[PDB]
Design a protein around this nucleic acid. Structure first.
Ligand SMILES: [Zn+2]
Ligand SMILES: [Zn+2]
Ligand SMILES: [Zn+2]
Lengths: 523, 454, 378, 116
RNA sequence: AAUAAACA
């Protein structure tokens, strides 16, 4: 332009934040709070704006202490480099950022290097500790035979120009939440060839506490010794019990008490709890053991499919997950000691892990796949497209970008009285969610999403409708809050145009897209 | 029945990594990508928080990136990016000034059911390679269909070379690279025309092969110049050796070959599992006993290749060269150990990047020691919640007593990130929960300011 | 006699256990993204840990070339076995013999589990459903029985006045088709046992029937050289197509589960691929059966590869895109192979002779030497 | 532990309503079946059930003191006309035939009863 | 009880 003008521009960025409930400022720049510089965005949903030398923009909410009126950096003698703000109720709070996390990642994270493959984790609620299965690599030396009398172990005798196979020895750690070091004299190390297939936190019924349940840590584990040796397994039920600490080591009050450790008749692949019953998967069977004083007494079983590698359950409905064949829902009565098959999937499906989509009255069966999919099954006996209560039916289809193994539910923050956000952490580092909705609020947004899919210049020319297709009919019923997030990114002139083209105003949609952001601000 | 998917955490973890001219031709910029997200990192050297990877732009795709190559087109002021998405979608994109977004240059959809030859279950990923002179670029659609993009609008219309209708009946491709030197885009293609499995080597000894197809762009033919045909049965990735030596190194699981058109084959063995498994003439590498099956590699300017093995162990292979620019012998050195990688990039000379899914993918720095052994130092590490196998919800232990009677649950998640030597737990906690060290009850005031007084 | 009432000593058993392989894949697939990320199973006997099932190596289907012999599984009455199926749980293996017996052989470790006196005639056909619910059988007599998972005898009915030779099943529990030696293909109602329609106009005895996994196509094969392969239309009853493929006596016809490829065994030493959406041309033929190719079974978790029996007991393994065969047993399975059946995990294959035996075939172990009498007789 | 945070004990799901009155279970075909994999019908224990013989779920009778040996492996031809029990309690098994008749047993993990 | 032990 020649006359002398700014040789810069400005690009708007996506958000998650809404400002909806002398001159008061809401934008307070802070330098040197816990090493960080940036902006605390005050108001009804307060947020932090953190940019380190990484240069990436970080939006961390602060939903505790409610809405926040004002803010100030505070550096004192008795207080370290921290901050200082008003409550909405007029409460001045000297405050310090907690110093163990790192606020430079998209969520605040502290990395705990175990230097060994952590397979599972299980927050034991009583005494408040974590129980991690691990595995380190030991160079193998023996090859187990089974020649007719007992196991014979052939010593690997090879050249000195020879690399060895890897034998993995498993141990169950005990990580303490107070300071994140592991706890000494609490490491259940397993046998020579025994591999942990599952660790969970299992609540079994007992006559000691005032409730029934107790909250143990149960771990299943089996011995891998190649395909010629019959793999057998062993249920390892533990318990973290507070004893007196050693003088000088206050972490060592926590220590395992292994109640049950007995070899089973086959490999233990998956564990679950149902009203205080232990539900374990051995072979092509799923067992229902009950915890007595010292022995497990069997109560129910069913001859299930090939390899049941995930089971979770609630209110005596057991949801299994095979590697190839099918998920199943099972059902345990108490008055008759019987476990039985209610509905299974009938089609082959290469599952990773399963969940429970919970509606106000509907229970959906969120089942991730090998092919980076999610899908919600339901048990609908009155439907005619299945058999009469003998075949599950998918009712939503979606294509996550990544493989998913982890699954959990939470209550979200009258509508949303009884619906659960069934979150997940994908196997590429990302954490998603599936917030259920009703029929009206969905279709006011599917009209928006179809208007967002076509009339926008998407990155790399990609089609968001066909990417979030099932990748086998694709009975999709799941929106995309990363495409609907672009409606929050449009200018308010452009916002009103796509509202008129679908037959509404922006304020109805902004009351629909910001209420799927407010009820999902946990952690 | 209905739901909304919302993505609470963008996927950390880099499956692809390159070093191209993303913003302009003046500076190179580390473009790395992961599952359905592109990242462009600059390079600081004088940072307060010393070298540090500074993010410059990040981009979300509606599709998982399955490969990524770059080429500076005719008269362009930037470097385009050849992305590759699932079921054979190429997409040439560019950064734009003005609008700070991308800009798609071309869209190539190859998801035709006659391009599969009936094979519904696509197992091979579409692989994008570029000619280092910038003459053309080739995508291996579906394992059996070399799609060639000719270059000079800055483009030419593509075409689909059938792989199985070539000579030698290629039929099971392992890797393909554009080789250096030459006057035409010669593309080496490792394959297995009579496929075998490690575990069945007594009736099928060694079946890997090489064809260096030479692409005629204008006439649209392709002479299959140079073929070898009894390479060891378990060859992993091939790698194009640069111009002053030329040729190719072909990583096998238990050996390592150096092949060229005018030179006899020279390849050594790296353990004594090559005894009854290989008839190829293998020497004995002295003082080395390792394997190369998942081993990412890049090249130092000439005659030095950084192999990061499985197990995260960096070896700097030296190709010992004669006076006639032919490889005589190899030379290893066990350099430092580092991340369990999934990629590798030479940045500015003396910096390496180790893109990894499972582990904090970090920036290294090699120097010369006082033949030419390299010592490594870690300068910066991109934080990387790895493949979260299991993750459980826990309650934090330092909630301050003022926030104690709050009605909502106040909890965090602990994530089994990483694997192996880079395995971890990660403590993810979305909000920020301060430590209230002193509270006050001052009603009536509504704003606040802080000043500094000596 | 044999009744489980006399005592025998304690023995350890030859085990082919997929569980240390499947556990290994679950631990793998977390940190594996592809097969291009997989750690190699180096050829030595020490790498017995690093086996994953064929789902683990989708790439490289030569995993499942099952030439390692495990166990001859013979009865005590010595009848030649005709049909072989695995229970879709991968748990056992019902097998049909000429006296009409269903010997249920074990899966991980093979013993014997029960005998049955099912058919009054030699068993000729056996298929399960798409869920594990119902098993279909048929014989030389004309009787078709339904079987549960616990092998309960259900209402039986004379489907044909002459010898049935196959029965395949729609993608549900509603419809299936049995061809017989009167020359017709009769498509059946599942629940009512009601004769829906007869597909006449075929010429001579049709000895195999396939059903396409989605589109509703009944494919057949024939001894009649004039009308060898007929596609059909199950709702109407009309001849949809006719494919002149073989010189004599098409034995067994199998489609993929992906829905495209027809595969056809025949007594002229040939297996042939036909793309069913293009019957004018012809895909590759498969040459290498030195006598007649009498049994064919597609691999479950690998499309592309299948095993192919012989009338000389030759047991060969093929792959789509690969012209000559991969595996090989000749003069090795002795007799005439009637049927094959992979385990649901595609890792261990069965067999069945016109001799009175029925051998089992697991994958080759890493780093063994194939000096076995099936592989290299030296 | 999944029951402190996202508890569902107060929800009466449609899934639990679907399995009390059984929500349209079809009277099963082929009356020579087994009723296998099916739990129990509460309509028979409390009062008259409604359908006889051709019914989905299981009908129990008294005076069953010994569990069924075939039923454990998954082979129950008899079904509900079985004179043996179909639980999993390890106290109502038969006497082992080779410990009662032929002196000692052979295997190490014999489930069946050994009495002297 | 209807093949629990069907062994080389
Ligand atoms: Zn009833
Ligand atoms: Zn019984
Ligand atoms: Zn006994």
């Amino acid at each position: 332009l020649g006359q002398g003008n700014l040789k810069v521009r400005f690009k708007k960025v996506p958000h998650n934040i809404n400002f909806r409930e002398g001159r008061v400022a809401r934008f307070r720049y802070f330098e040197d709070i816990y090493g960080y510089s940036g902006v605390f965005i005050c108001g009804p949903s307060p947020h932090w704006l953190l940019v380190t030398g990484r240069g990436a923009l970080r939006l961390h909410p602060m939903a505790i202490d409610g809405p926040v009126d004002s803010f100030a950096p505070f550096h004192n003698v008795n207080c370290p480099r921290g901050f200082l703000y008003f409550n909405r109720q007029g409460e001045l709070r000297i405050s310090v950022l907690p110093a163990y996390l790192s606020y430079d990642a998209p969520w605040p994270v502290r990395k705990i290097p175990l230097r060994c493959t952590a397979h599972y984790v299980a927050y034991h609620v009583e005494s408040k500790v974590y129980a991690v299965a691990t595995s380190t690599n030991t160079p193998c030396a023996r090859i187990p035979r089974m020649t007719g009398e007992e196991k014979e172990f052939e010593t690997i005798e090879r050249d000195e120009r020879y690399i060895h196979p890897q034998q993995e020895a498993f141990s169950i750690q005990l990580i303490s939440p107070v300071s994140w070091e592991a706890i000494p004299n609490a490491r259940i190390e397993l046998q020579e060839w025994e591999h942990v297939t599952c660790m969970k936190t299992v609540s079994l019924r007992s006559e000691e506490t005032v409730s029934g349940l107790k909250g143990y840590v149960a771990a299943g584990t089996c011995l891998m010794q190649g395909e010629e040796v019959t793999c057998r397994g062993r249920i390892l039920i533990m318990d973290v019990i507070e004893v007196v600490p050693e003088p000088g080591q206050p972490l060592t009050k926590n220590k395992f008490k292994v109640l049950y450790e007995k070899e089973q008749k086959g490999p233990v692949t998956a564990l679950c709890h149902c009203n205080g019953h232990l539900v374990s998967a051995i072979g092509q069977k799923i067992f229902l053991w009950s915890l007595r004083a010292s022995e497990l007494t069997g109560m129910a079983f069913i001859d299930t499919q090939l390899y049941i590698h995930q089971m979770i359950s609630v209110k005596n409905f057991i949801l299994a997950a095979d590697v190839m064949k099918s998920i199943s829902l099972l059902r345990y009565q108490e008055e008759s000691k019987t476990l039985s098959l209610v509905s299974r999937d009938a089609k082959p499906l290469e599952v990773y892990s399963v969940d429970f989509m919970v509606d106000n009255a509907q229970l959906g069966f969120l089942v991730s796949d090998r092919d980076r999919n999610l899908m919600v099954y339901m048990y609908l006996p009155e439907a005619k497209e299945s058999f009469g209560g003998m075949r599950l039916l998918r009712r939503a289809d979606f294509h996550v970008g990544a493989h998913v193994n982890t699954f959990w539910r939470t209550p979200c923050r009258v509508v949303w009285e009884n619906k659960h956000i069934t979150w997940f952490a994908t196997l590429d580092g990302g954490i998603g969610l599936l917030l259920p909705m009703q029929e009206k609020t969905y279709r006011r947004l599917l009209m928006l999403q179809n208007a967002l899919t076509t009339m926008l210049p998407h990155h790399a020319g990609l089609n968001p409708r066909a990417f979030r297709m099932l990748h086998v009919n694709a009975v999709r019923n799941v929106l995309d809050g990363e495409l609907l997030n672009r409606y929050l990114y449009l200018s308010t002139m452009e916002r009103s145009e796509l509202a008129k083209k679908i037959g509404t105003t922006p304020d109805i949609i902004l009351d629909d897209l910001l209420e799927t952001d407010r009820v999902t601000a946990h952690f | 029945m209905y739901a909304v998917y919302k993505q609470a955490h963008p996927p950390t973890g880099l499956e692809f990594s390159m070093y191209c001219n993303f913003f302009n031709n003046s500076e190179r910029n580390l473009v790395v990508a992961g599952t359905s997200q592109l990242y462009v990192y600059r390079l600081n050297r004088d940072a307060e928080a010393r070298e540090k990877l500074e993010l410059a732009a990040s981009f979300s795709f509606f599709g998982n990136v399955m490969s990524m190559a770059s080429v500076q087109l005719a008269g362009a002021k930037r470097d385009a990016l050849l992305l590759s998405f699932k079921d054979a979608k190429l997409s040439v994109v560019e950064y734009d000034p003005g609008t700070h977004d991308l800009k798609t240059l071309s869209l190539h959809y190859f998801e035709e059911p006659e391009l599969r030859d009936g094979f519904v279950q696509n197992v091979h990923t579409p692989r994008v390679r570029v000619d280092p002179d910038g003459r053309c670029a080739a995508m291996l659609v579906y394992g059996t269909r070399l799609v060639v993009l000719p270059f000079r609008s800055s483009f030419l219309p593509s075409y689909i070379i059938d792989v199985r209708a070539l000579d030698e009946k290629l039929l099971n491709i392992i890797d393909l690279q554009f080789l250096h030197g030459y006057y035409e885009p010669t593309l080496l293609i490792l394959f297995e025309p009579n496929q075998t499995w490690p575990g069945r080597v007594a009736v099928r000894q060694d079946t890997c092969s090489i064809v260096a197809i030479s692409l005629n762009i204008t006439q649209k033919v392709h002479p299959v110049i140079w073929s070898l045909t009894s390479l060891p049965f378990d060859c992993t990735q091939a790698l194009a050796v640069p111009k002053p030596i030329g040729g190719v190194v072909v990583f096998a699981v238990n050996s390592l070959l150096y092949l060229n058109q005018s030179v006899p084959p020279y390849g050594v063995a790296l353990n004594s599992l090559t005894t009854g498994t290989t008839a190829f003439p293998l020497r004995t590498q002295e003082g080395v006993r390792i394997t190369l099956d998942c081993a990412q590699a890049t090249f130092i300017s000439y005659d030095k290749m950084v192999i990061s093995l499985k197990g995260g162990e960096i070896y700097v292979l030296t190709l010992i060269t004669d006076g006639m620019r032919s490889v005589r012998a190899f030379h290893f050195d066990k350099a430092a150990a580092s991340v369990l990688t999934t990629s590798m990039v030479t940045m500015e000379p003396g910096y390496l990047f180790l893109g990894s899914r499972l582990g904090n993918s970090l920036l290294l720095k090699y120097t010369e020691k006082l033949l030419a052994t390299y010592s490594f130092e870690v300068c910066d590490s991109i934080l990387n919640i790895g493949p979260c196998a299991n993750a459980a919800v826990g309650e934090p232990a330092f909630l301050s007593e003022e926030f104690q009677n709050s009605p909502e649950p106040d909890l965090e998640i602990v994530v089994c990130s990483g694997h192996g030597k880079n395995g971890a737990l990660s403590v993810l906690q979305k909000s920020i929960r301060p430590q209230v060290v002193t509270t006050f009850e001052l009603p009536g005031c509504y704003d606040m300011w802080t000043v500094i007084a000596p | 006699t044999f009744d489980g009432k006399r005592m025998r000593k304690a023995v350890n058993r030859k085990t082919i256990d997929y569980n240390p392989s499947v556990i290994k894949y679950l631990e793998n697939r977390i940190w594996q993204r592809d097969q291009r990320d997989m750690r190699a199973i180096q050829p030595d006997a020490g790498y017995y840990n690093d086996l994953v099932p064929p789902i683990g190596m989708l790439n490289n289907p030569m995993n499942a070339v099952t030439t390692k012999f495990v166990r001859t599984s013979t009865n005590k009455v010595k009848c030649p076995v005709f049909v072989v199926r695995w229970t879709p749980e991968g748990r056992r293996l019902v097998t049909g013999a000429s006296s009409g017996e269903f010997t249920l052989w074990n899966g991980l470790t093979f013993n014997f589990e029960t005998i049955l006196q099912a058919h009054d005639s030699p068993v000729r056909a056996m298929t399960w459903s798409h869920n594990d619910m119902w098993m279909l059988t048929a014989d030389h007599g004309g009787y078709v029985k339904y079987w549960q998972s616990n092998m309960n005898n259900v209402k039986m009915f004379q489907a044909h006045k002459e010898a049935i030779r196959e029965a395949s099943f729609s993608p549900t529990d509603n419809k299936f088709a049995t061809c017989s030696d009167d020359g017709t293909v009769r498509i059946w109602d599942f629940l009512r046992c009601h004769e829906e329609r007869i597909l006449r106009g075929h010429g001579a005895d049709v000895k195999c029937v396939d059903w396409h996994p989605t589109k509703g196509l009944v494919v057949s094969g024939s001894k009649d050289s004039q009308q060898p392969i007929k596609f059909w239309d199950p709702k109407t009853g009309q001849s949809l197509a006719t494919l002149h493929a073989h010189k004599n006596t098409v034995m067994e016809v199998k489609l993929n589960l992906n829905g495209n490829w027809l595969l056809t065994a025949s007594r002229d030493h040939l297996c042939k691929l036909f793309d069913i959406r293009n019957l004018k041309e012809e895909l590759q033929v498969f040459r290498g059966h030195k006598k007649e190719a009498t049994a064919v079974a597609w691999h479950p978790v690998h499309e592309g590869l299948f095993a192919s029996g012989g009338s000389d007991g030759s047991l060969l393994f093929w792959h789509v895109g690969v012209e000559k065969e991969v595996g090989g047993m000749e003069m090795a399975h002795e007799g005439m192979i009637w049927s094959l059946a992979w385990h649901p995990l595609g890792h261990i294959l069965c067999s069945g002779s016109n001799d009175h035996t029925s051998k089992f075939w697991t994958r080759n172990r890493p780093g063994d030497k194939m000096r076995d009498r099936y592989n290299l007789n030296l | 532990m999944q029951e402190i945070i996202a508890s569902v004990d107060h929800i009466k799901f449609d899934l639990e309503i679907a399995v009390e009155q059984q929500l349209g279970a079809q009277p099963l075909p082929f009356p020579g079946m087994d009723k296998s994999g099916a739990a129990v019908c509460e309509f028979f224990l409390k009062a008259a059930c409604g359908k006889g013989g051709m019914c989905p779920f299981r009908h129990i009778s008294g005076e069953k003191t010994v569990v069924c040996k075939h039923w454990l492996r998954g082979l129950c031809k008899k079904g509900d006309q079985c004179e043996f029990l179909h639980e999993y309690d390890m106290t109502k098994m038969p006497e082992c035939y080779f410990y009662s008749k032929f002196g000692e047993c052979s295997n190490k993990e014999c489930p069946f009863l050994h009495i002297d």
